[PDB]
């Protein structure tokens, strides 16, 4: 866990800095949702923009993703690395969720363009869905293994070891610790992760509204997610 790293960002630099553009691309728009339900409609959904008001470094070694209303619209943020990694590595981020409020939908996850998703941790502000770690096999998202995870606003590390045997997850890993969830390889239909050449990219985001965020009006904004580092080894 001390490296050397295949990929890392320590998010160091002065307050108000952009994240390192050699490691991240900042989202400029929320993913459009076909046949939107109420909180997914264009007029209700939270947006993403590359604006230092929403995605910036705090000068204390953290990425800040900040959700806030600006002229009738909630804006927040997402960063995704162009860097992709294959099977057989460990992926970890140190995160503080100061955004566990109605409407928010933060996540730390590993993505793929075509099939498969590893949601290392995610919280739902909609008032209905439980915070959880989830592995998805199908693009529809509709085949998954999930485990609910109790979340607070403290600092924690969130680790996924993704190797040929599957995925193992830890919160606040320390020597000898037991994963809180394990997903066996080949345990979902058309499991994609063991395919030769399959890769994932790291993503950090704080969304507002949409399906998972729901109504932000009961929430308290601005709200933030802090990330001290992402490390892959």
Binding residues for Mg(2+): 10, 61, 228
Q: Which stretch binds Mg ion (CB under 5 A): 40-48, 97-105, 212-220, 223-231?
A: 223-231
CB 192 within 8 A of CB 112: yes
Select the residue whose beta carbon is closest to Mg ion and give its number: 61
Contacts of 34 (CB under 8 A, 6+ apart): none
Residue closer to Mg ion (CB basis): 209 or 226: 226
By CB under 5 A, tell whether 19 contacts Mg ion.
no
Pairing of strands 73-80, 47-48: parallel
Query: Nearest approach, Cβ of 229 to Mg ion (angstroms)?
Result: 5
By CB under 5 A, tell whether 86 contacts Mg ion.
yes
By CB under 5 A, tell whether 173 contacts Mg ion.
no
Q: Which stretch binds Mg ion (CB under 5 A): 9-17, 45-53, 70-78, 141-149?
A: 9-17
Give residues in contact with Mg ion (CB under 5 A): 10-11, 61, 85-86, 228-229
């Amino acid at each position: 866990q001390s490296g050397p790293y295949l990929f890392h960002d320590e998010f160091d630099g002065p307050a108000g800095s952009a994240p390192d553009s050699s490691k991240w691309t900042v989202a400029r728009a929320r993913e459009e949702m076909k046949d939107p339900t109420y909180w997914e409609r264009p007029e209700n959904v939270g947006q993403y923009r590359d604006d230092r008001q929403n995605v910036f470094l705090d000068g204390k070694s953290n990425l800040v993703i900040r959700a806030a209303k600006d002229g009738g619209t909630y804006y927040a943020g997402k960063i995704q690395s162009p860097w992709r990694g294959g099977i057989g590595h460990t992926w970890e981020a140190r995160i503080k969720f100061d955004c566990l409020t109605a409407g928010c939908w933060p996540a730390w996850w590993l993505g793929n363009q075509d099939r498969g998703e590893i949601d290392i941790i995610e919280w739902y502000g909609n008032g209905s869905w439980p915070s959880a770690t989830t592995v998805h096999a199908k693009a529809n998202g509709s085949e998954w293994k999930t485990r609910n995870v109790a979340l607070d606003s403290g600092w924690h590390t969130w680790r996924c070891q993704w190797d040929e045997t599957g995925m193992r997850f830890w919160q606040d890993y320390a020597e000898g610790a037991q994963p809180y969830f394990t997903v066996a390889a080949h345990s979902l239909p058309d499991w994609p992760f063991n395919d030769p050449g399959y890769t994932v990219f790291p993503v950090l985001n704080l969304a507002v509204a949409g399906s998972g965020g729901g109504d932000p009006r009961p929430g308290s904004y601005p709200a933030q997610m802090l990330v001290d580092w992402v490390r892959v080894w």
